Symmetry: C3
Subunit: 157 residues, 3 copies
């Protein structure tokens, strides 16, 4: 059996940098407003993984209303989601993540992001892709109001 999933997330800028994306602290004039650590990339990825396993989404598994997850390490959440996916008999095919942001520059950090995500999913780095694109000053990402991220995931068996 092969199964696909798709995730999508958005956080607004606010407060002071740095931002955490893909598990990586990236310097920036602004921070990301969030109940958790604000990791848009890892939230979208988790949604894509949960989606492929028909387990719902981060909001189902870890509510924005529970004080246990305030300030939470989004990597913990990723690892918890992954344990529950594996408990259902799933194994990783591949993941592909798309960070949508006018700034900061993401490319320097992508290698460490992939290190983190490969480790969290107990897979090879070769099964994890991350990329970035701007929207050329258009939309809320273009105007510097926030960052969006998508992910797809392919699961096996």
């Amino acid at each position: 059996e092969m199964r696909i999933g798709h995730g999508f997330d958005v956080h607004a800028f606010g407060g002071e940098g740095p931002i955490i994306i893909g598990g990586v602290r990236i310097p920036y004039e602004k921070g990301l407003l969030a109940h958790s650590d604000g990791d848009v990339a890892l939230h979208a990825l988790t949604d894509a993984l949960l989606g492929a396993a028909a387990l719902g989404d981060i909001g189902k598994l870890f509510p924005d209303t529970d004080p246990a997850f305030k300030g939470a390490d989004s990597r913990e959440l990723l690892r918890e989601a992954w344990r529950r996916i594996q408990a259902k008999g799933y194994t990783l095919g591949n993941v592909d993540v798309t960070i949508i942001a006018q700034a900061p520059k993401m490319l320097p950090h992508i290698p460490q992001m992939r290190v983190f995500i490969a480790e969290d999913l107990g897979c090879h780095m070769d099964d994890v892709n991350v990329k970035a694109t701007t929207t050329e000053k258009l939309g809320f990402t273009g105007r510097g109001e926030g960052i969006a991220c998508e992910a797809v995931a392919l699961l096996i068996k």
Copy 2:
């Protein structure tokens, strides 16, 4: 033997009175959605993903804005009919995953019923259907309460 991927995306603007129909579910809201059909963004994006996997183009290439026969149409009927044409070509369902993007109303209490509706229209197990929701934290047209967007991916098997 063969596996195929599809992607769909759809947007409707709010307008007039509630309720809204999303994933076939009547959801109470102070506003409705503007559409030629019933406005089911979630089912429109799903349909587009299924047709795209089967390389049959899209929902426009089957049910045009022009035709007055599709006015107020049950998007489930469109879904079932696109599904018939996809099956006519040899494909069976792998799985589908749908992402509703909206600031409001809350979608989560309605997701189980949406999945029941979609699993039936596609003749599959409910375990092959996933629906989720996310806000854009007040950002963009969805964040400002102007509309709702939905995305879907589908895997088909031949």
Copy 3:
């Protein structure tokens, strides 16, 4: 038997004179698309989907906006070079599905020609390439006619 999924997304802003180039096709329009290369949002998003599935990064990494060698670049050359690298890694094409998000110009008449170009660029049959277009009902930056967005998913086989 190994299959891999990829996703790409891109946006370009309108500006300067038409025509625009989308999916390889010169499309008459009142404004152009501002880019470093020729501005083909569709092929960029598609290239990213393919590169993503192969875990080769993205177009910005492969073809930096800083390098003058890519000024005015034919996006189809970028697509074919990315594809060559993916194939060197042992991948063959499952299928692709592309969604153009634009208020105008009208994409439908041009889609057959886009599919021919993409099919040629990937050494595949047209059956394995789906392209569709949709609007966001006058919402957001595409709805206001500010630019054009494109998403793509891809399935690769090793």
